[PDB]
Write a protein that binds this ligand. Structure first.
Ligand SMILES: Nc1ncnc2c1ncn2[C@@H]1O[C@H](COP(=O)(O)OP(=O)(O)OP(=O)(O)O)[C@@H](O)[C@H]1O
Ligand SMILES: Nc1ncnc2c1ncn2[C@@H]1O[C@H](COP(=O)(O)OP(=O)(O)OP(=O)(O)O)[C@@H](O)[C@H]1O
Ligand SMILES: [Mg+2]
Ligand SMILES: [Mg+2]
Ligand SMILES: [Mg+2]
Ligand SMILES: [Mg+2]
Ligand SMILES: [Mg+2]
Ligand SMILES: [Mg+2]
Lengths: 441, 441
């Protein structure tokens, strides 16, 4: 149970709305002391920013591990020669940040890792009985985005969990796809989000193994066309069996129309969605699952021996979650006039203690008591022990979006009561200060 | 309890001592399926290697936090404008990896973060009442080492925990320095190491505020002179009070002679250290604590308003732990002829189950029983369920360094017994199946 006293913390709250911020999420992240811009599209994560980033990572890691994925780490710097093997060194484009070392060797900050994971695989895996296999990392990306914008939403240095699956053939690769589908539905649900999987841009051989997970939002870049029925589908629980038939689940999700603007078909839209359920809106892309087949295993020669002594290129898929983008996305969906409203699973703290008369021996002594008690019980607690006046303590607390507040002061406390305020709806309640620890654990 | 079955893992064991490896720790990291080179000094962390790196990381973090330091995350790329402020852009030398983006703007992959952290601080901290403040992060660094060597021990892309303290004056900085001294003693102790605080090279302006923490090894790059009594000093428990006087803790560690080749004075060593106690050997620097006073605050005009009423530049110190170097150091100190011997705090798994007849209906059943039950009770458990023969399962288990092994074969289970083997000393015990969990739990 992680714990902090605000006076022992670094949380530089901003009084005014920063003029460089064009949207809510960006604006609130700067003002809640979560983020500092160091270059265009390149940010430092200040303490509170960091805590939520780490909460999000964990959830992503857990749902990857539940689905069978195995975690590694690839370096951020990759050699160009590896990318020359695939064709992509020159076909990728200006988004690639190329680097020369002291010896003039050609490097590049990885924008993605298809070549490097196929290179690691082909070194060690030679048989079909190793497969399916899915390896992932959570690692910093660099895309030299032409016009960085919207804070974490479109940065240059960003965090992606990217996972890549290896299979004998398409049929199997499809099984690997379906695992990730379900893992992603659960990943986003756990963050308080309805990230709807939409049919997305496929490659040249087309087919149907490309989806984008899109959080609905007027201020998003993706144009989207859905049947509203999609927004009410049930999400698999933690006990979903990842070795079984996942088809009946996927079919639930893929049976209602949901296409991005890239693959939308207006004829097919009408003749499938009732005008009643048609929503043409937009959203924020928080992940993407994509089957690529033998695109890298062909040119880089990643083969295995099949179940008939025969050598063939493996079939691949890639799966990406925008981990840092997600802080932006979550704030868009979870805010009000007074600031952030974190889902509990991602909040940097679960509870903040507001001393409403700092120094005063009765309130200080009660706030110390409540602090170490909740602290010792496993609860993530922030104790606002600063010199600030009450109204400032309230405003800061509402702003940084901590799920629950405990209001402690001379009025209620020198009478044996504290106040518990839920951030989500503003629900107030009075409790004896002995009973409140129990309420939260 | 982060549990895994070896049939569903990625652990590419290597039969033959790789030719590229010059020292034990690099050889075993490769053999044990922990590491894979992608360029000189740049490595992918394979699943078992990554798990160790994360354990080390968490220990480092927990100990920084206990001492009161506050975690953020600075980006890997920094502006050259930033380093021109300090003068260090052109002074740092050819280890700095310079990068030009698409708009011709000048960046670098940061080799250290003193300018960046002084820039964050100066944007926000204006008064001495915000001090002392320690901000730190665990981030990937690049240093274009002249000769990358010794695997992870001298990489180019490497992980460091770097902390940076801010204080009003020199007196206050020494206090910040002492907390990190104590935190480093605790950090390295928890890793099963004797990293010794040696007096190290000081800045141009002299003094007694530089210490390298060095784990002795015949083979290391650092030349060290010690009083052997230093190896037996006590390491403060976790209830050490950081807000109080740490001097008597520091004075116990500084009173025995210990110095690196660069500050060693033979005359003073002859005088202070009894002939029998004298020891001149090598070791691996795993950490450094360092005071730089006003070095960055001066050039970058990062002042606070003091208690006397007036403006003055802050005093700083930097404290670095080689997180990734630490896997090489631990293996050097903790191995035998059979492979790695992980201290259990940094070990990738706590117990490995070895099934000695794979497919035997009876022993499969007992292994699963054991696997699932050790999961549920908290234990990092590997179940080697592979189609290997016993002699191979012992060899891999020994090699990868897992602290405990449970040997399970048809013989012992007919008597309702199993073996528990300790990797470190080869201790073994024969006991009831129904009893093995309780010892481990
Ligand atoms: N510049 C960026 N900043 C932050 N997150 C990003 C960025 N680029 C991609 N992401 C995240 O990475 C995920 C997977 O990466 P992918 O390469 O599929 O993105 P993309 O299709 O190039 O994104 P976009 O179309 O937004 O530029 C995306 O779904 C998104 O959540
Ligand atoms: N090239 C490297 N590879 C791995 N770890 C390193 C490397 N350089 C530094 N470190 C780690 O970071 C810590 C602090 O960094 P610092 O800049 O003080 O190292 P340094 O003086 O450059 O040491 P070295 O003499 O090893 O180059 C070091 O104690 C070491 O453990
Ligand atoms: Mg893009
Ligand atoms: Mg896209
Ligand atoms: Mg995409
Ligand atoms: Mg060096
Ligand atoms: Mg050094
Ligand atoms: Mg050093």
């Amino acid at each position: 149970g992680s714990h902090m006293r605000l006076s022992r913390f670094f949380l530089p709250i901003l009084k005014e709305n920063p003029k460089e911020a064009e949207i809510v999420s960006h604006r609130l992240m700067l003002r809640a002391g979560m983020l500092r811009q160091e270059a265009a599209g390149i940010y430092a994560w200040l303490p509170l920013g960091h805590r939520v980033l780490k909460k999000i990572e964990q959830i992503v890691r857990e749902e990857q591990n539940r689905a069978g994925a195995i975690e590694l780490l690839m370096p951020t710097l990759q050699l160009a020669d590896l990318w020359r093997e695939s064709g992509r060194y020159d076909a990728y484009g200006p988004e690639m940040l190329r680097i020369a070392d002291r010896h003039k060797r050609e490097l590049l900050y990885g924008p993605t890792n298809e070549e490097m994971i196929t290179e690691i695989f082909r070194a060690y895996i030679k048989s079909y009985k190793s497969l399916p296999l899915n390896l992932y990392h959570i690692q910093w990306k660099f895309r030299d985005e032409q016009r960085p914008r919207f804070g974490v939403m479109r940065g240059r240095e960003f965090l992606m969990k990217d996972a890549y699956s290896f299979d004998v053939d398409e049929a199997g690769a499809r099984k690997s796809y379906n695992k990730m589908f379900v893992a992603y539905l659960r990943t986003f649900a756990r963050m308080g989000l309805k990230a709807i999987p939409m049919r997305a841009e496929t490659g040249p051989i087309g087919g149907d193994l490309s989806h984008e997970f899109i959080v609905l939002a007027e201020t998003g870049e993706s144009g989207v066309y859905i049947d509203r029925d999609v927004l009410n589908l049930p999400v698999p629980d933690e006990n979903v069996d990842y070795d079984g038939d996942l088809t009946p689940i996927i079919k639930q999700w893929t049976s209602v129309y949901a296409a991005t603007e890239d693959v939308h078909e207006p004829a097919r839209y009408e003749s499938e969605v009732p005008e009643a359920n048609r929503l043409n809106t937009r959203g924020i892309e928080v992940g993407q699952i994509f089957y690529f087949g033998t695109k890298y295993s062909d040119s880089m020669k990643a083969n295995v021996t099949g179940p008939d002594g025969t050598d063939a290129p493996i079939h691949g898929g890639s799966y990406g979650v925008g981990v840092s983008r997600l802080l932006g996305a979550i704030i868009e969906a979870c805010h009000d006039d007074n600031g952030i409203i974190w889902p509990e699973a991602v909040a940097p703290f679960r509870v903040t203690i507001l001393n409403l008369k700092q120094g005063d021996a009765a309130t200080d002594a009660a706030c110390d008591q409540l602090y170490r008690e909740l602290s010792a019980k496993g609860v993530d607690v922030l104790y606002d022990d600063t010199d600030q006046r009450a109204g400032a303590k309230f405003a800061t607390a509402d702003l940084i979006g901590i799920p629950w507040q405990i209001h402690v002061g001379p009025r209620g406390l020198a009478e044996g009561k504290v106040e518990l305020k839920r951030r989500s709806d503003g629900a107030r309640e009075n409790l004896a200060l002995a009973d409140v620890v129990a309420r939260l654990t």
